[PDB]
Design a binder for this molecule. Structure first.
Ligand SMILES: Nc1nc2c(ncn2[C@@H]2O[C@H](COP(=O)(O)OP(=O)(O)OP(=O)(O)O)[C@@H](O)[C@H]2O)c(=O)[nH]1
Ligand SMILES: Nc1nc2c(ncn2[C@@H]2O[C@H](COP(=O)(O)OP(=O)(O)OP(=O)(O)O)[C@@H](O)[C@H]2O)c(=O)[nH]1
Ligand SMILES: [Ca+2]
Ligand SMILES: [Ca+2]
Lengths: 156, 162
């Protein structure tokens, strides 16, 4: 239920191991920096950071091309830690300043399937972008909490 | 040293995604709204603070470990009376850093992993929490079990509240 929204999750790979290695002082510095970078890039594509998960973010966009372009630019900027990015779209409930519903959970699982450095999108996102964006042929996976399988597409 | 000492409690609903898929978004939103208010109310009764939400769970801060455990116990009692959702609870203490409306640092991450280890319906606490509550006349623990926690080297003994 709810309004249609594109949901993007970012997540740092193995952030606990990282925190343990470099220590809390360096980690807070790092994540503050990362937060500012992500916020900047999200805003450039007219997105809004909805919520923090500590070593990652939940971001809302009106259009799928905005989300994917944001993901592309974030990976580019990081190459200048490894981050996984997943993107899904569908109706979700935007209540208080949070997002809820099965399509939020699905975006979350799509991000969880992504490798560090990868941008993964669900089939609805892929099908909506058939403007400067190329995809692989997809991979079929089971997603925790959902029945059956889903084809997820990596951005090239 | 960086950070203020705090007791961190995480709650998490077991298999919330599958639950959401069963009951639908409308009923889910109503359910988690009710859950949010239940947790918030019980937390404030033990002088705690809900720091942040993880959708189907919360990060909560307490000054004292007795407060966190009493809260956990009361929450499980409330959830039993209500019953269907099962909530896992994990508690750890140490210094952590506040940034915005969230807590950061290895001891937050540790609390998170202690919670992840807990079964639905269970309260697990780390060894420092158990040790801090040795003298308590009301709080009782089991003998503990050794685990390894993602992101951390070595092993850690975790204790269930009885
Ligand atoms: N501030 C804040 N931190 C959170 C929240 N939810 C989770 N965390 C933190 O997120 C971290 C755990 O993230 P994970 O991604 O599971 O851990 P990881 O070590 O990165 O492992 P992988 O991503 O699986 O490689 C812990 O530090 C948690 O304390 C939140 O809502 N707010
Ligand atoms: N609103 C909100 N939701 C979050 C946040 N972090 C994670 N989530 C949600 O948390 C849910 C996934 O939680 P999990 O505990 O991994 O899923 P689960 O199905 O309960 O699985 P188990 O706990 O392993 O049994 C998804 O619905 C995510 O969208 C957050 O910061 N804010
Ligand atoms: Ca991570
Ligand atoms: Ca859960």
């Amino acid at each position: 239920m709810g309004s249609r929204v594109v949901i993007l999750f970012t997540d740092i790979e193995e952030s606990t191991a990282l925190n343990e290695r470099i220590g809390d002082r360096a980690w807070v510095k790092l994540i503050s920096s990362h937060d500012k970078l992500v916020s900047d890039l999200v805003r450039r594509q007219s997105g809004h950071v909805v919520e923090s998960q500590g070593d990652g973010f939940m971001v809302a966009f009106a259009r799928p091309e905005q989300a994917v372009r944001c993901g592309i630019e974030l990976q580019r900027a990081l190459r200048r830690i490894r981050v996984r990015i997943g993107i899904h779209m569908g109706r979700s409930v935007r209540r208080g300043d949070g997002l809820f519903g099965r399509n939020v959970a699905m975006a979350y699982r799509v991000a969880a399937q992504a490798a560090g450095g990868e941008i993964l999108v669900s089939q609805p996102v892929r099908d909506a972008l058939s403007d400067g964006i190329r995809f692989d042929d997809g991979r079929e996976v089971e997603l925790k909490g959902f029945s059956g399988t889903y084809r997820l597409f990596a951005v090239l």
